[PDB]
């Protein structure tokens, strides 16, 4: 019956690549792409290379999904100087990479509970050194958080999960953008005239060949289904030490011993 696991993507840095990167300007998109969480999925099963192209991408390519923005991280650019033939000649190759900094996400994966049941025991224990879509970008939160359950609609699943808070006096996005796929309600349905095309759909893996997909914007305000969570967990150390104990019951009796 639990048809959806809510992937938790959170770290200091993360990047799921966009289409406009063939040359040294390598860029990302403001959403975890389909093959930016399916690569995490394939690593979580412990396989890769050309095995994912068969029976692993089409095994879920018939399955719709939705993503949620807990906080929109800002885009950061890192200088990167490949040394080429230096640790050919000493001609230093040049590049620039795009990094999404301090962004938390929540992906949905809906339709049936057997694959989600296989997948629930894939995030925590089975690994192939999973990261946030970039090899040098660590997931700072337990990815196996937000336990599965039955919520029939995309919005109900995407909004029926508690929303975290790091410190008490922290600004919180009152509108949570939702990225959802296209639902063919009837055969012959044409896409609405606001759905931008994203090119995140692999049919092979190495070397990357791709298919496009339709992405529908959606919105979510807090309060009706989603809500803040308990924070606790004091991030303030200030080394502990008691003081000022005249007597509870064990100073009267303990003064006399050394007297």
């Amino acid at each position: 019956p639990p048809n959806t696991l809510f992937l938790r993507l959170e770290g200091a840095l993360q990047s799921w690549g966009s289409n406009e990167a063939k040359f040294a300007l390598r860029r990302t998109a403001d959403a975890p792409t389909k093959s930016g969480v399916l690569g995490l999925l394939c690593a979580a099963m412990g396989i890769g290379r050309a095995e994912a192209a068969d029976s692993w991408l089409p095994k879920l390519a018939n399955l719709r999904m939705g993503v949620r923005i807990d906080r929109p991280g800002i885009r950061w650019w890192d200088f990167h100087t490949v040394g080429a033939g230096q640790r050919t000649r000493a001609e230093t190759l040049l590049s620039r990479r795009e990094y999404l900094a301090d962004a938390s996400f929540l992906v949905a994966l809906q339709g049936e509970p057997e694959l989600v049941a296989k997948l629930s025991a894939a995030l925590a224990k089975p690994v192939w050194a999973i990261y946030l879509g970039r090899k040098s970008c660590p997931p700072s939160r337990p990815v196996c958080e937000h336990p599965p359950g039955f919520y029939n609609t995309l919005e109900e699943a995407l909004s029926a999960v508690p929303l975290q808070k790091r410190w008490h006096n922290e600004p919180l996005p009152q509108i949570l953008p939702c990225v959802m796929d296209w639902i063919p309600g009837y055969d012959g349905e044409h896409a609405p005239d606001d759905a931008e095309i994203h090119y995140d759909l692999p049919v092979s893996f190495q070397p990357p060949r791709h298919l496009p997909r339709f992405v529908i914007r959606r919105e979510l305000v807090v309060g009706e289904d989603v809500q803040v969570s308990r924070e606790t967990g004091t991030s303030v150390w200030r080394p502990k030490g008691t003081r000022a104990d005249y007597n509870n019951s064990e100073y009267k009796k303990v003064r006399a011993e050394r007297l």
């Binding site: 289409n19 406009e20 063939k22 040359f23 040294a24 300007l25 403001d30 800002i74 885009r75 950061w76 650019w77 080429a84 033939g85 050919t88 001609e91 040049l94 590049s95 620039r96 795009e98 296209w182 063919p184 012959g188 349905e189 044409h190 896409a191 005239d193 931008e196 095309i197 090119y199 049919v203 092979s204 070397p207 990357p208 060949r209 791709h210 298919l211 496009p212 339709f214």
Partner: protein, 438 residues
């Protein structure tokens, strides 16, 4: 082997019903109203639509029927395109579509070629295969996106690949219909035989299908068995290409329907460099630059979704490619404000080059200002056409988003809880890009 454009599937396109296939020409103009151009490379989409637009202009010159809106392409083009099967052929004895031998990898500019390096980005010339479809849609980038090959190898019909401004639509019929503006000259397109030089101002279909480089190609004793560079597993693939240079003769007064031209006549290139030199600061995709020559000279203010392609290139180095679907309805224009918008790179570099204190002219300034410029540009540029039309989005309120990243950068820069450090943080906050009248 036998190949044909009208018969064999070549263009990767999504359907409005929701299934991307590979289809040939006859299905994509006979349906023409349930599909969209779906290429990973954006200027590749632009090249394929350019080919379709030149084909439509050819069909209009022959059968004389304009494309009416909200109705697929007229049926009077298949009895003009169905009788010529010797026309669009690639291999064999006959005229082809569009000594010196270079690698086939330089034809598709995204794939690295025989550079001055012992190694490339995990590719190697004359080794990695490439399929017929990508070769053929890489030949469409010859007339329109050909760069300088070291000042001795010529370019295309323009000295540098210009900025291309172009109208986008939800429909392929809508794409062809919204960009139908013709001119009285006919020209001589390259799918005919040897073009006649005749007089200058050769036309439109001649410049749409201009050939800066001859391509012949060669096929060895069969070929491969699976893909190695493309990604789509295909049959025996090609090995290498053949290329030569036609020196474009002087003169040839020619203005591009989609091109963006400087007032002095040179082509306008995209202004993106990965180096933040003394005169440049890396910001983002430069949709802002090609607005003066397309909202004042050709097309001007008009209804329809506008699309922008920028392929920056310095001499013979391809550095990036991107796209931008910008919003445009045609509510007139302001000359001066759009002139400031026509180059924000100078303003951004002038804002970056300001140091913390002093007056030296080529000090690097604040280098962490340059690290927050791209996110601010991405936040500004999502409603780039709303900023363009000047309804409620202006320069003076676009920099209001810069304040937050600048507050936290100033928190990093002046880590003192003093009165003075708070004052320098506040003076740091007031920084914003000032417009320039060039």
């Amino acid at each position: 082997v036998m190949y044909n454009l009208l018969c064999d599937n070549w263009v990767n396109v999504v359907y409005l019903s929701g299934k991307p296939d590979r289809i040939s020409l006859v299905q994509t103009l006979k349906d023409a109203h349930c599909l969209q151009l779906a290429y990973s490379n954006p200027m590749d989409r632009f090249t394929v639509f350019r080919f379709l637009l030149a084909l439509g202009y050819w069909c209009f010159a022959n059968t004389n029927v304009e494309p009416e809106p909200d109705k697929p392409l007229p049926v009077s083009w298949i009895p003009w395109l169905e009788e010529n099967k010797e026309y669009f052929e690639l291999f064999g004895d006959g005229k082809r579509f569009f000594s010196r031998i270079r690698a086939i990898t330089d034809l598709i500019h995204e794939i690295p070629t025989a550079h001055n390096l012992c190694h490339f980005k995990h590719v190697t010339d004359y080794i990695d295969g490439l399929c017929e479809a990508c070769c053929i849609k890489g030949l469409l980038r010859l007339p329109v996106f050909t760069t300088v090959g070291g000042r001795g190898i010529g370019a295309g019909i323009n000295n540098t690949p210009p900025f291309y401004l172009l109208w986008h639509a939800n429909d392929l019929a809508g794409m062809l219909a919204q960009n139908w503006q013709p001119w009285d000259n006919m020209g001589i397109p390259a799918w005919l035989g040897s073009f006649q030089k005749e007089s200058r101002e050769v036309g439109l279909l001649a410049g749409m299908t201009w050939l800066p480089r001859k391509v012949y190609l060669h096929d060895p004793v069969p070929g491969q068995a699976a893909c190695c560079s493309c990604g789509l597993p295909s049959e025996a693939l090609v090995y290498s290409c053949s290329i030569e240079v036609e020196p474009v003769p002087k003169g040839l007064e020619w203005k591009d329907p989609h091109g963006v031209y400087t007032d002095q006549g040179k082509s306008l290139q995209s202004k993106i460099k990965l180096m933040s030199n003394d005169r440049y600061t890396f910001a983002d995709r430069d949709w802002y630059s090609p607005l003066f020559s397309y909202l004042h000279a050709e097309g001007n203010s008009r209804q329809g979704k506008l699309w922008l392609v920028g392929f920056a290139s310095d001499k013979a180095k391809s550095i990036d490619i991107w796209d931008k679907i910008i919003e445009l309805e045609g509510t007139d224009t302001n000359d001066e404000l759009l002139a400031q918008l026509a180059n924000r790179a100078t303003a951004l570099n002038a804002m970056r080059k300001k140091p913390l204190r002093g007056d030296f002219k080529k000090s690097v300034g604040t280098p962490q200002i340059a690290d927050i410029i791209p996110h601010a540009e991405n936040r500004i540029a999502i409603n780039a056409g709303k900023m363009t039309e000047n309804r409620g989005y202006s320069w003076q309120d676009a920099d209001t988003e810069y304040g937050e990243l600048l507050t936290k950068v100033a928190y990093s820069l002046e880590p003192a809880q003093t009165v003075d450090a708070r004052l320098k943080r506040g003076n740091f906050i007031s920084r914003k890009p000032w417009p320039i009248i060039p």
